[PDB]
Amino acid sequence: MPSTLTINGKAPIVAYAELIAARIVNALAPNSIAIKLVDDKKAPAAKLDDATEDVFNKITSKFAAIFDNGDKEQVAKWVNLAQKELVIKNFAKLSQSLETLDSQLNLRTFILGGLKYSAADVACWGALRSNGMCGSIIKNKVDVNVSRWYTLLEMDPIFGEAHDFLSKSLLELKKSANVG
C-alpha cells in the first residue's frame, strides 16, 4: 500500500520540491506514493503520511533506493540552502544565494556534478519554482549557469509539468466539489 503525499494548492510557498521528489519516485517505482490534494491556506504545505515536519527529507530517506546519488552531507547542504534560503522572498539574500548556486554550476550540469541529477537539484529547482522573485535576479545578475540548469530541468516533464499537474488536479477537485 503506497505512502500518501498531500500537496496543498493554497500554500503560499507551494511544495514543488516534495511533489517532484514523489514524481521521481513513482517514475522509477510506480505506485510508491499516492498523491492527495488539499486547497486550504490553513493546512500544511505538504504531509507525508502523518508527518508535517521535514517532509522533503522524509521522502528522500524513505525512498533511499531512488535517491541514491550524492554524499549525504553534500546533499544536505544544498537541500538546506533550498529550504532555508532559496524560498525566501528577500532580494539581497536571494541574490547572494543565487550567486552561490551559480558558482557551483559553473563547471557542472547538476549541483553535485553527476551524470544524473540528485535530491540537491530537486530541492533547489522546487524552491526556485515556488519563488517568483528569482526570475529577474537570475537574469539581471547574469546567473547564467542557474538559468541554463533551470531550463534543462524544466524541459524534463517530471519537473516542468509539476505545476500543470497540480493546477489541473486542483481544477478537477473544484469541478468535483461543484457537481450537482
Please tell me the distance from the alpha carbon of residue 59 to that of residue 68, in angstroms, as a whole number. Answer: 12
* DSSP H stretches of helix in the chain: 16-28, 55-62, 72-81, 91-104, 119-130, 134-140, 144-154, 157-160, 162-177
Please tell me the distance from the alpha carbon of residue 35 to that of residue 33, in angstroms, as a whole number. Answer: 6
The C-alpha angle with vertex 167 and arms to 153 and 172, in degrees rounded to 5, equals 140
In the chain, list all ranges with CATH 1.20.1050.10.
65-155
- With contact defined as beta carbons under 8 Å apart, do 31 and 2 qualify? yes
Please tell me the distance from the alpha carbon of residue 48 to that of residue 171, in angstroms, as a whole number. Answer: 22
Strands 33-38 and 3-8: parallel
Terminal CA-CA length for the chain = 33
Q: Please name the helix (run of DSSP H) or strand (run of DSSP E) that holds residue 6, with its range, or none.
A: strand 3-8
Q: Compute the radius of gyration of the chain from its Cα atoms.
A: 16
Domain range 65-155, its CATH number among 3.40.50.410, 1.20.140.10, 3.30.450.20, 1.20.1050.10: 1.20.1050.10
Name the structure determination technique: X-ray
At the top level of CATH, which class does the domain 1-64+156-180 belong to? alpha beta
* Contacts of the segment 56-61: beta carbons below 8 A, 24+ positions apart: 56/17, 56/18, 56/21, 56/83, 56/123, 59/5, 59/18, 59/21, 59/22, 59/25, 59/33, 60/21, 60/119
- Residue 8: CB atoms within 10 A of its CB come to 21
DSSP label of 86: I
In the chain, list all ranges with CATH 3.40.30.70.
1-64+156-180
Please tell me the distance from the alpha carbon of residue 146 to that of residue 106, in angstroms, as a whole number. Answer: 9
Comparing CA positions, the residue from 64, 4, 59 lying closest to residue 31 is: 4
- With contact defined as beta carbons under 8 Å apart, do 56 and 17 qualify? yes
Q: How many residues does the chain have?
A: 180
Please tell me the distance from the alpha carbon of residue 143 to that of residue 59, in angstroms, as a whole number. Answer: 30
Q: Judging by beta carbons within 10 Å of its beta carbon (0-12, 13-18, 19+), is residue 59 exposed, middle or buried?
A: buried
Please tell me the distance from the alpha carbon of residue 57 to that of residue 171, in angstroms, as a whole number. Answer: 29
